[PDB]
């Protein structure tokens, strides 16, 4: 059953990486009233917001992550949240961790002798999911500062998190099975 | 217009939808991390059996029991497992205290688009309970049917 | 004018009746999914779990009362039943506590007249338990006397 | 005893089926204010409503499950609940499941070599109890949708639910004991 | 005159004194009845050990844990013991729900004779906790001293 | 303007600090009264109970969080500590819940911005636990490699 | 240790019986404002209330357990509570149960062969305490329908309940020890 | 190791004693509005209050633990709390218990055959921590009896409490291990 488990792990890792990359790249994260000129229904992602329908359909504008004026530096937590949202460091970190987990899976399939690599892969996947969670929260918090709705990029990210957790569990199970085989062989040889 | 009674799923009203989704994600992540820190180490194993009983299914069951304020027959014993359990317990305390503070008010809110709670205000939880009972009965019957077919195939 | 049983006011009578019915149904379904299949019995036969009808009723009562549990279900279907019962219990008990807090503030200390009914119920339950224990004892004593004959 | 357990299961199944049939057929479910022609004390059931006092005693009416209301802004959940209450599909399903459980009991009496019939009867009885619970909840919720009381047909239904759950427990125990006996015979 | 802050024992304010006395009496009676129905029957015994672990001290501990909504490692298994436990659980649920509904309001009431809770409003519970810790330390030390003296007397 | 950690508003900061201090003291005293006496050790020596300092801290944390307990004290002094800690926990948690209910109604659904801090704390705790487990694993691996040399 | 336990049980049973009898007999149950003629400070028991101090000091009047007028019957629970309080059936039942427990203790000390009698005694004591509890509640409920205080008869009854519980526990322990001795002798002879 | 445990226990005991003595002696417990002569920012300790800014920097006052209030309707509990705070008996008791625990540690170092001295030191350290907790609660409650902050003397006391509890745990473990060694030697 090792081959089936490894195929499932590889397919899930690739799917989660592709979903997270598409979610970061695309701009259909949120549907809300706004303006794309520097009010009309618009779709906004992590980097740009574009007007759909209207006289300015298809025009995209970079999102200003530091709204308001007078530069009220009364709270540092708000500035930290704005900087974290503007950088989008957590979704990108999740993408990087998914890529590293896939690379570790490939390296394990290549060497076929170092078990710890498998474990590392699993950690990455789990870590990626955790990062994903933080990003989601940050994004929603950034929307705190009219009915709105979430596009398919948000749910692509959520599905990426779920698949990353599943792949991490599968990788940990594979690691445990490899150590089971090692213990059985050691018992047989001793 | 006419007053709008709360929906069949009004028990989710006290928290926003994003909070519920984040709770589901946090539950999944906590269960996965608990299982990983409880079972990954080969030095926690002994043909060979783990020192702890925290598999993925048992981790999910423990997390659900902790969030439901019920508990189970198992509890983490390692340092990292206990860290996960304690942080999950703190999260559960905060979230459940926030959710149950004004549940009845959300259950009996009237909108345009004191009194005892009525059965109409809590019909959804009864429907969900009966549906869960039926689903469990169906799952048990399916497993029984499968095992009986496998045993019959082995016999002949 | 609140009575001796005014603590039941926050929930309607139909809610209490349906709570009793749901408790009975949950206990029965838990016992059924835990004990029916012959593949959980291994060689007087012994079951893998300990979820009989009496144990199932005890588990459901403990879960609803927010009290500790001696046993927990281990199978998939039993755990489905347990989880859905936990969800129901959380919702219902939280709603009862919220409505009771609303009722009690319609800062005056609670009086014994408002909670005399629960004391009456407790004493009646203690008497019933003592009577049941004595009946079982004298029945077993009669059986032993007949056996020794 | 196997014979005593069989007798108790059959008697309980018949009692639950009869109680459910009587409750569904009869029209003494609720006592409340209402009219019986075309506001006085009136007893109503699942189908009919009849005033028990006044100048129009006896002659009475079918329940208007879909009354001539404003008809505007009616939620789909409300219509679903109203249709479910009007059909009374859950009490009738409980009656049917109780009848099927009794039929399974009779077949097992005629087919003692087959043990899955006992399990089928137990499943039918438990399902009938669950359906009765759902029907009671639906009926009360539809009624609430100001002084009233519950008649003896509602309590007949409640007693039928309790007896059905008890008989399901007995049938499951019978199945368990039969499989235990089979295992003991094979092992010895 | 000046406002009167609640006393050091203001945590007993939500319930009347008669209720507290009746709670103490009910706790004693429940523990005694549980022990009696659990241990009186010679057919519950086996040099001979009881089937259950519900002695008088263990019965008191179980009743206190049930009333505190904490629980212990034991639970009644007999029919009568479980009846006692269930009725005590119902009593505990009702009484604790009544008591904890508006605890903060009773803790911060001002009398002549929203805001966060202050440490002054909950100093009494801290004093009682530290006193209980000291009492437990003293009891353990006394038992240790007694056992050491007995062992020394046995030695010589 | 509530912040990310607005869930700590119902209790003052001094109350939280004293709660931490009381938890530490209760755990230490429970361990002391459970393990100090040599007459609870019977013949690597094994104790009658399992209330070490780590187990005592776990028990106190579980008792304060209204969660299930793996172990319960059995001695007189240990049970005194447990009972007084249970009383303290009941009073403090009930007061926190009552004040939180008062705070939240100064019927609007709670927003994610009001409870983002608890999510941050949870994720940080998960990361810390994973780091601790990995550190222990690689330490044990290094020790085994040195032993095999 | 059997003799010490039996002496403690007998002394406790006698003390509880005497305390309950005195509490029922005496009239210093409650101190409150009132009148002892058919407002001044008065002390009232289960049966009679007497004025202390004033111009009518020492005058006792039977307590009227059915106050108000018009004989309203909208509630039967209130009439039941008033009848139970007027009868005082629960304190008297507690006294009777304590007397029966003491009689059972004496009969056991007489026969010295029938163990079940001991058990019966214990039950009586426990039962007595339960009855005592009910009476207390009823009494306080009867005071629901001006600062007040409870006299030493109320606390005599409370102490009687506590001692009754202690004596019941001791009797159950003696019963268990007797069956322990019986089992040990049976094992020795078999 | 026994020597490492000895060194850690001695270092922790000395650190806790020094922190408690510094906290009690120093006057940077609280920052709040107040006067320093006979309403400005001011740091106050257990005994003295001194304003850290203004025209009267440096020169400062003894805390009036019993201020010239109306003196009417002074509850006995309030007077008890005020007297306890004025004496600062609990911080001083914590200092004394820490010193006694250190003395017990030194005596056990000089009296290695006696094992109850380790237990005495552990009891002293735990008691000192409990006394420090009580003193902190008393100080805060008396202070509350509107913008303020806590200085580094208060945190020195808190750190002393934590270190004292840790050293008590270490001493109890030391006692347990010594008795374990004695039992192992006797058994073998
Ligand atoms: Ca619990
Ligand atoms: Ca509440």
From Swiss-Prot, chains A, G:
One Gene Ontology MF term: ionotropic glutamate receptor binding
GO cellular component: AMPA glutamate receptor complex; cell surface; cerebellar mossy fiber; glutamatergic synapse; hippocampal mossy fiber to CA3 synapse; postsynaptic density membrane; Schaffer collateral - CA1 synapse; somatodendritic compartment
Distribution of this protein across tissues and organs: Brain.
Segment forming the signal sequence: none
Primary residence: membrane
GO process terms (BP): eye blink reflex; membrane depolarization; membrane hyperpolarization; nervous system process; neuromuscular junction development; neurotransmitter receptor localization to postsynaptic specialization membrane; positive regulation of protein localization to basolateral plasma membrane; postsynaptic neurotransmitter receptor diffusion trapping
Recorded superkingdom: Eukaryota
Transmembrane segments: 6-26, 87-107, 117-137, 156-176
Keywords for the protein's UniProt record, in alphabetical order: Calcium, Calcium channel, Calcium transport, Glycoprotein, Ion channel, Ion transport, Membrane, Phosphoprotein, Synapse, Synaptosome, Transmembrane, Transmembrane helix, Transport, Voltage-gated channel
Membrane topology recorded in Swiss-Prot or TrEMBL: Multi-pass membrane protein
Transmembrane listed as a keyword: yes
Places the protein is found: Membrane; Synapse, Synaptosome
Disorder named in the UniProt entry: Defects in Cacng2 cause the stargazer (stg) phenotype. Stg mice have spike-wave seizures characteristic of absence epilepsy, with accompanying defects in the cerebellum and inner ear.
Protein family (similarity comment): Belongs to the PMP-22/EMP/MP20 family. CACNG subfamily.
Protein name from the UniProt record: Voltage-dependent calcium channel gamma-2 subunit
Organism: Mus musculus
Name of the coding gene: Cacng2
Full protein segment contained here: 5 to 216 of 323
UniProtKB/Swiss-Prot annotation, chains B, E:
Residue window of the full protein shown: 528 to 847 of 883
Inducing factors: Down-regulated in the pyramidal cell layer of CA1 in the hippocampus by global ischemia.
Lipid linkage positions (S-palmitoyl cysteine): 72, 145
Effect in UniProt of substituting residue 69 to R: In RNA edited version
PTM annotation: Palmitoylated. Depalmitoylated upon L-glutamate stimulation. Cys-72 palmitoylation leads to Golgi retention and decreased cell surface expression. In contrast, Cys-145 palmitoylation does not affect cell surface expression but regulates stimulation-dependent endocytosis. Ubiquitinated by RNF167, leading to its degradation.
The protein's name in its UniProt record: Glutamate receptor 2
Leftover remarks: The postsynaptic actions of L-glutamate are mediated by a variety of receptors that are named according to their selective agonists. This receptor binds AMPA (quisqualate) > L-glutamate > kainate.
Organism of derivation: Rattus norvegicus
Curated annotation (Swiss-Prot), chains C, F:
Transmembrane segments: 13-33, 76-96, 115-135
Location(s) in or outside the cell: Cell membrane; Postsynaptic cell membrane; Postsynaptic density membrane
S-palmitoyl cysteine lipid sites: 69, 138
Tissues showing expression: Detected in forebrain. Detected in dendrites of neuronal cells. Expressed in the pyramidal cell layers of CA1 and CA3 and in the granule cell layer of the dentate gyrus.
Lineage top rank: taxon: Eukaryota
Free-text description of this protein's post-translational modifications in UniProt: Palmitoylated. Depalmitoylated upon L-glutamate stimulation. Cys-69 palmitoylation leads to Golgi retention and decreased cell surface expression. In contrast, Cys-138 palmitoylation does not affect cell surface expression but regulates stimulation-dependent endocytosis. Ubiquitinated by RNF167, leading to its degradation.
Non-spanning membrane segments, not crossing the bilayer: 51-66, 67-69
Free-text domain note: The M4 transmembrane segment mediates tetramerization and is required for cell surface expression.
Other information: The postsynaptic actions of L-glutamate are mediated by a variety of receptors that are named according to their selective agonists. This receptor binds AMPA (quisqualate) > L-glutamate > kainate.
Family: Belongs to the glutamate-gated ion channel (TC 1.A.10.1) family. GRIA2 subfamily.
Protein name per the record: Glutamate receptor 2
UniProtKB/Swiss-Prot annotation, chains D, H:
Subcellular localization: Membrane; Synapse, Synaptosome
Tissue expression notes: Brain.
BP term (GO), one: regulation of membrane potential
Membrane topology classification: Multi-pass membrane protein
Cell membrane among keywords: no
Domain of life: Eukaryota
One Gene Ontology term of the molecular function aspect: ionotropic glutamate receptor binding
Any one cellular-component term (Gene Ontology): AMPA glutamate receptor complex
Signal peptide: none
UniProt KW keywords: Calcium, Calcium channel, Calcium transport, Glycoprotein, Ion channel, Ion transport, Membrane, Phosphoprotein, Synapse, Synaptosome, Transmembrane, Transmembrane helix, Transport, Voltage-gated channel
Biological function: Regulates the trafficking and gating properties of AMPA-selective glutamate receptors (AMPARs). Promotes their targeting to the cell membrane and synapses and modulates their gating properties by slowing their rates of activation, deactivation and desensitization. Does not show subunit-specific AMPA receptor regulation and regulates all AMPAR subunits. Thought to stabilize the calcium channel in an inactivated (closed) state.
Illness association: Defects in Cacng2 cause the stargazer (stg) phenotype. Stg mice have spike-wave seizures characteristic of absence epilepsy, with accompanying defects in the cerebellum and inner ear.
Name listed for the protein in its UniProt record: Voltage-dependent calcium channel gamma-2 subunit
Source lineage: Eukaryota, Metazoa, Chordata, Craniata, Vertebrata
Shown part of the complete sequence: 5 to 214 of 323
């Amino acid at each position: 059953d090792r081959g089936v488990q490894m195929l499932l792990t590889t397919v899930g890792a690739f799917a989660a990486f592709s979903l997270m990359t598409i979610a970061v790249g695309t701009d259909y994260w949120l549907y809300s009233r706004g303006v794309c000129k520097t009010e009309v229904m618009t779709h906004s992602g992590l980097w740009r917001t574009c007007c759909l329908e209207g006289n300015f359909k298809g025009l995209c504008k970079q999102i200003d992550h530091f709204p308001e004026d007078a530069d009220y530096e009364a709270d540092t937590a708000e500035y930290f949240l704005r900087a974290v949202r503007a950088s989008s460091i957590f979704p990108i970190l999740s993408v990087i961790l998914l890529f590293m987990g896939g690379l570790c899976i490939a390296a394990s399939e290549f060497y076929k002798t170092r078990h710890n690599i498998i474990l590392s892969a699993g950690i990455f996947f789990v870590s990626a999911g955790l990062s994903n969670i933080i990003g989601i929260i940050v994004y929603i918090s950034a929307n705190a500062g009219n009915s709105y709705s979430y596009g398919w990029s948000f749910y692509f990210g959520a599905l990426s998190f779920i698949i990353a957790e599943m792949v991490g569990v599968l990788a940990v199970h594979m690691f445990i099975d490899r150590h089971k085989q090692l213990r059985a062989t050691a018992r047989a040889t001793d | 217009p006419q007053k709008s009674k709360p929906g069949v799923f009004s028990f989710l009203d006290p928290l926003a939808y994003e909070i519920w989704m984040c709770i589901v994600f946090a539950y999944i992540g906590v269960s996965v991390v608990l299982f990983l820190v409880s079972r990954f180490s080969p030095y926690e194993w002994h043909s060979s059996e783990s020192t702890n009983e925290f598999g993925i299914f048992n981790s999910l069951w423990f997390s659900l029991g902790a969030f439901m304020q019920q508990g189970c027959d198992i509890s983490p014993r390692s340092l990292s497992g206990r860290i996960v359990g304690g942080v999950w317990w703190f999260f559960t305390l905060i979230i459940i205290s926030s959710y149950t503070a004004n549940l009845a008010a959300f259950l009996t809110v009237e909108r345009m688009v004191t009194s005892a709670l009525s059965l109409s205000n809590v019909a959804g939880v009864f429907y969900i309970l009966v549906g869960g009972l039926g689903l469990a009965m169906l799952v048990a019957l399916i497993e029984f049917c499968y095992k009986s077919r496998a045993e019959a195939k082995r016999m002949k």
